[PDB]
Design a protein around this ligand. Structure first.
Ligand SMILES: Nc1nc2c(ncn2[C@@H]2O[C@H](COP(=O)(O)OP(=O)(O)O)[C@@H](O)[C@H]2O)c(=O)[nH]1
Ligand SMILES: Nc1nc2c(ncn2[C@@H]2O[C@H](COP(=O)(O)OP(=O)(O)O)[C@@H](O)[C@H]2O)c(=O)[nH]1
Ligand SMILES: [Mg+2]
Ligand SMILES: [Mg+2]
Lengths: 202, 215
């Protein structure tokens, strides 16, 4: 018996929280592999479902998105992807169409999740209403906070259900995660769950 | 004290045009059909549908008509004190889907804002007429849509699980075992159903806003 494993490419502008988000899964950070010529650290994030164990091999840049775009060798053969932006910085959100264009060019029809990071910060600029355009392009969306572990499992559980072809798949146990570095205010979480229902109802 | 401690129970009214499959749908729960009670003043059968959740047992008292919706509207006593509802139509007959707004408006006049599920029945029939493209304009205030097939038991538990989450105020509530159901009288194609479920989700997002200024 082999191992069920998928290549996942994590992309988005420099400074949005890609490396802080991938590093919450403790054992994946411990067993990571650095490949200098591709400009990547591949993290093996194992998750335990009701039908057995699965492995997401998450590709995280080495910081070469700050002064340029990514090569075709980073994208080739990916089976799924995450695009990230910061919700306190509008320029990171406006570059989302161009990250999506690269994924489509090299990989065609793969399941992709869009993530808005840094929702623990009070003065938010990009809100639920501005994500409607991306949902019409077939991206799935979640509000995330990498520092407090808010909604960490959501992107990986939606991607596992799509790939396997089972809408009733569940995780039976959570992976060991880095302890929260900030508190996710509970009044802000309830308001943002309300914003998303109002924007996407009907 | 199990008998002293009451029962959690809700009145559910089941409404929609004559011939849409309401009686057939409510009869799939076998113990509900065996224990039903007749009310002669209003002409209704009340079926006690028991479901077992992760926090314990609950009971939906379903009020099914005796066919007086075929000749006209229903009296005020049928609707009074309902806590939730189901509105049904037939996907091979377009006049039943066009009367959906009139059934909704009767509900809100007597009962105001109770939680409602809209069901499109008879998705086992090959030549389907009302599809997902036409259905995604009706889901608005306090309402949810599910495709359904009463003869094959397709999606039977979905309307009842969405309503229990809304009535109790618990979005993580689950059913821990299924009720005994009448054995299927026709097969629902598994590849057809998944296609139909994906069609509703993509029709959802194509109807949506994209108009600046929304609060
Ligand atoms: N408060 C807060 N700061 C965050 C969060 N995610 C990232 N940051 C900050 O954003 C900066 C860049 O993070 P980094 O992981 O290097 O992002 P990357 O360049 O996309 O890989 C750092 O100062 C982080 O501490 C978040 O969830 N909350
Ligand atoms: N094939 C099929 N026929 C159905 C289904 N539901 C209802 N019918 C048929 O539709 C007709 C009306 O059913 P009935 O339960 O009397 O509906 P009511 O008047 O709304 O209470 C009958 O001939 C049923 O057998 C279904 O899921 N599949
Ligand atoms: Mg980085
Ligand atoms: Mg009937």
């Amino acid at each position: 018996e082999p191992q069920v494993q998928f290549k996942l490419v994590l992309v988005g502008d420099g400074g949005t929280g890609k490396t802080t988000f991938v590093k919450r899964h403790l054992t994946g950070e411990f067993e990571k592999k650095y490949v200098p010529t591709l400009g990547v650290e591949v993290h093996p994030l194992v998750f335990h479902t009701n039908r057995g164990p699965i492995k997401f091999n998450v590709w995280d840049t080495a910081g070469q998105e700050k002064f340029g775009g990514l090569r075709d060798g980073y994208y080739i053969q990916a089976q799924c992807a995450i695009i990230m932006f910061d919700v306190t910085s509008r320029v990171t959100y406006k570059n989302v169409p161009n990250w999506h264009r690269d994924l489509v060019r090299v990989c065609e029809n793969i399941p992709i999740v869009l993530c808005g990071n840094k929702v623990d910060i009070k003065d938010r600029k990009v809100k639920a209403k501005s994500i409607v355009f991306h949902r019409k392009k077939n991206l799935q969306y979640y509000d995330i906070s990498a520092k407090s572990n808010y909604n960490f499992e959501k992107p990986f559980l939606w991607l596992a259900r799509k790939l396997i072809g089972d809408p009733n798949l569940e995780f039976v146990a959570m992976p060991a995660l880095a302890p929260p570095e900030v508190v996710m205010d509970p009044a802000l979480a309830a308001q943002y769950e309300h914003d998303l229902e109002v924007a996407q109802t009907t």
